[PDB]
């Protein structure tokens, strides 16, 4: 069976790497607003529905191609999604929208054991995103893999607080603290990237795009073999956990200094090594349409001692080096603008290893 | 000035479409042998000097007329070459031969900017082929266009390896790999179709009919404004590049899966999108006297989002459709037998646009 991955560090053998092609700026709706920095709101407001700057896309295509070259050199089989024009405007009985991209396979696909799961998503512009990955998935299915699609939301107005009182990322942090997000508990919704795997235990966070109902669906679906845990952080990332709490080995985790985990003690009690990465050196003038500067910690482990880290981020390179982990430096500075780093731009389909517990 | 075309995708306004009339089977000489499949060698051997099957020609005439109708509907001005009897036997001080046809304007004319260039050709049966296009060209010249005729070869025996050790297309692929072609470097020779335009950069391949001297002449003639590059492929097409590496937009190229480009990385580095088309569905029983089944990828771009593709080739139709490109399906199944698809049967004289670089 081609699909088999229980965690984020076992020897990587196959991966899916996204595409920057035809990436389209999402229309400026409430959920887009709640998941981006104020600095970019007028960008979304004006560019919505058009393609992201093509000169920028062209550089990202190049960076990602090089990344694929390096993976193949490191002995990893690379699969890529189908090219699709994301500008097409579709219409469901609940809404009408243009698409986004298929740059981040981690946002939509998660692999637990021999099973590939497609997330429902929570953004209207990402409703038909699964279309780009179906060729790959059907192939794995024909070859024995289990295939699951979580319940696709209707994404009707009832799923969103159209009145989410956010005027700055400062307001959003406060609301998040109060337990208030842009998504209601109207129906299950989630991004696969809000879940991070560690064998028998998976960790998730209720975020702007992943609600309690969505986590419950995962929990109920994977039990009894896996335990999904809910953890929280201070000033959390509006969406996705992989640049906030990135698990890099059996009991080692990168905890973003700016988003401390409220349940950090559960990990200290387990005898886990909490590593706090040094600050990103990326220039503040460089555009990050989604995400933040902390993409520097969004690393991909080829194995326990080999990490694919950004070529520009020298300080975090040294940290890995003092730890005895070989750094494979790749530059994806323009690809970063789309919203992700190495962990985001990939989905590990097969890692050589077995199911185990690391929480004892 | 009626002539103005810098690439293969800007909004098409004027085109020259070939004729199937009086097409004549070329005598079976060494260069014909090196540019056709073994299956057809006895056809050339027996039919040489006579017309291609008239019942077949009649169907091609009909198909091409419909194509012209569709172009006019799409707002393109269509010009056609003069009707000529290709059976006439001519004699130069170097050889004697009967002619071929004027079906493929792409084989003989190339437009770079405001300049129309007539290629020298490398086949004896195509020595006086330019005669069919002179009425059109003189008109453009009277209207301001620049007109150039590359040095017409003598086509003496010294230009051919009369002993080219080819017994199958398998042998030819091996020889081509060794850098051995049926044409020597005795004098410049080339088919315009071995060059494909992308603004300031033009790409060419040393082929069975286009030698290094021919490419050098082009390079020396077009410099400094244009850079002609030489690229190569595995198991290349004996002649012409447009069904091996068809550039369909600013940074998008169709790379024939069976003829991979040795310099593909130069393009990946530029941030270019390499698209690999699905396999042709044309029946193996259908005669293709020249060329191959890959004529399916020999598409013509009316603009960046409109492509004239074969009505029968459904799989490649879908590919364009998922990319957001409107397909204009036309059936030219019998016209294909003569050696070309849409790109071959035409020569874009005017495309609305400017000279630019896409290789950065």
Instruction: Give the DSSP letter string of B18-78.
Output: -B-TT-BPPP--HHHHTTS-GGGHHHHHHHTTSBS-HHHHHHHHHHHHHHHHHHHHTT-EE
* Residues on chain A bordering chain B, Cβ-to-Cβ distance under 8 angstroms: 21-22, 57-62, 65-66, 69, 82-85, 87-88
Query: Residue B134 class from Cβ within 10 Å (0-12 exposed, 13-18 middle, 19+ buried)?
Result: middle
Residue contact A22–B272, C-beta within 8 A: no
Integer Cα distance of A105 and A206 in angstroms: 20
Residue with tokens 């075309």: B5
Annotated ligand binding at B291? The verdict is: yes
Query: Which residue precedes each gap in chain A (C to N above 2.5 Å)?
Result: none
Annotated ligand binding at B168? The verdict is: no
Whether omega before B252 lies within 30 degrees of 0, making that bond cis, reads: no
Question: What does DSSP assign to residue B334?
Answer: T
- CB neighbours of A298 closer than 8 A, spacing ≥ 6? A242, A243, A246, A340, A341, A342, A343, A344
B256-263 own/partner pairs: CB under 8 Å, 24+ apart: B256/B294, B256/B297, B258/B294, B259/B233, B259/B234, B259/B235, B260/B233, B260/B234, B261/B231, B261/B232, B261/B233, B262/B231, B262/B232, B262/B233, B262/B234, B263/B231, B263/B232
Integer Cα distance of A191 and A253 in angstroms: 21
Residue contact A58–B269, C-beta within 8 A: no
Integer Cα distance of B360 and B201 in angstroms: 10
Residue with tokens 């050889």: B95
- CB neighbours of B83 closer than 8 A, spacing ≥ 6? B19, B21, B22
Q: Which of A10, A56, A189, A191 is catalytic?
A: A191
Mutation target vs B (from A55, A64, A67, A83; most B CBs, 10 A cutoff): A83
Q: Residue A264 is encoded by which pair of tokens?
A: 């950090």
| Structural domain count of chain A | 1
**Catalytic annotation present for A240:** yes
Cβ-nearest to A59 among B271, B323, B324: B271
* Strand ranges of the sheet holding A109-112, from the earlier edge strand across to the other edge: A109-112, A115-118, A146-149
Annotated ligand binding at B259? The verdict is: yes
Residue contact B323–A60, C-beta within 8 A: no
Cβ-nearest to B268 among A57, A65, A85: A65
Q: What is the resolution of this structure in A?
A: 2.6
Distances (CA, A) of B129 to A197, B29, B82, B149, B279: 68, 18, 11, 13, 33
**Catalytic annotation present for A191:** yes
Integer Cα distance of A190 and A66 in angstroms: 31
Q: Residue A317 is encoded by which pair of tokens?
A: 């390179």
- CB neighbours of B283 closer than 8 A, spacing ≥ 6? none
CATH number at A335 reads 3.75.10.10
For residue A275, give its domain range: 1-360
**Catalytic annotation present for A235:** no
Integer Cα distance of A298 and A193 in angstroms: 11
Least Cα separation, residue A55 to chain B (angstroms)? 9
* Strand ranges of the sheet holding A195-198, from the earlier edge strand across to the other edge: A195-198, A201-204, A227-230
Q: Residue B48 is encoded by which pair of tokens?
A: 């040489």
Q: Where are the alpha helices (DSSP H) in chain A?
A: 30-33, 41-47, 54-73, 105-108, 134-142, 169-178, 212-222, 264-269, 314-322
Q: Which residue of B has its CA nearest to A87?
A: B324
Integer Cα distance of A15 and A5 in angstroms: 10
Residue contact A82–B322, C-beta within 8 A: yes
Integer Cα distance of A127 and A98 in angstroms: 9
Beta carbon pairs, A and B, within 8 Å = 38
């Amino acid at each position: 069976c081609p699909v088999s991955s229980y965690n984020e560090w076992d020897p990587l053998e196959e991966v899916i790497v996204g595409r920057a092609e035809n990436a389209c700026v999402p229309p400026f709706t409430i959920e887009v607003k709640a998941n981006t920095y104020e600095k970019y709101w007028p960008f979304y407001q004006k560019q919505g529905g058009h393609y992201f700057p093509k000169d920028h896309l062209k550089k990202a295509v190049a960076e990602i191609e090089e990344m694929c070259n390096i993976l193949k050199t490191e002995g990893v089989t690379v699969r890529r999604p189908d090219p699709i024009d994301w500008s097409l405007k579709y219409k469901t009985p609940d809404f009408e929208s243009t698409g986004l991209y298929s740059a981040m396979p981690r946002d939509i696909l998660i692999v637990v054991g021999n099973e590939i799961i497609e997330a429902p998503m929570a953004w209207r512009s990402r409703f038909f995103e699964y279309r780009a990955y179906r060729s790959i998935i059907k192939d794995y299915f024909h070859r024995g893999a289990k295939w699951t699609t979580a319940p696709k939301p209707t994404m009707a107005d009832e799923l969103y607080n159209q009145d989410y009182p956010i005027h700055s990322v400062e307001d959003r942090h406060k609301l998040a603290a109060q337990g208030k997000f842009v998504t209601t508990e109207f129906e299950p919704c989630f991004d696969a990237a809000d879940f991070i795997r560690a064998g028998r235990d998976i960790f998730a966070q209720r975020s702007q795009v992943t609600n309690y109902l969505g986590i419950e669906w995962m929990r109920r679906h994977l039990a009894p073999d896996y335990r999904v845990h809910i953890i929280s952080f201070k000033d959390p990332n509006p969406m996705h956990i992989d640049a906030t709490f990135n698990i890099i080995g059996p009991g080692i985790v990168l905890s973003n200094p700016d988003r401390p985990c409220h349940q950090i003690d559960l990990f200290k009690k387990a005898g886990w090594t909490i590593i706090t990465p040094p600050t990103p050196i990326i220039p503040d003038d460089h555009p990050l349409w989604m995400s933040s500067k902390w993409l520097s910690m969004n690393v991909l482990m080829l194995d326990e001692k080999r990490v694919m880290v950004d070529a520009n981020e020298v300080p975090i390179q040294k940290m890995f080096e003092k730890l005895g982990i070989t750094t494979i430096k790749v530059n994806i500075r323009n690809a970063n603008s789309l919203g992700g780093g190495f962990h985001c731009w990939t989905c590990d389909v097969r890692r050589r290893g077995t199911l185990q517990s690391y929480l004892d």
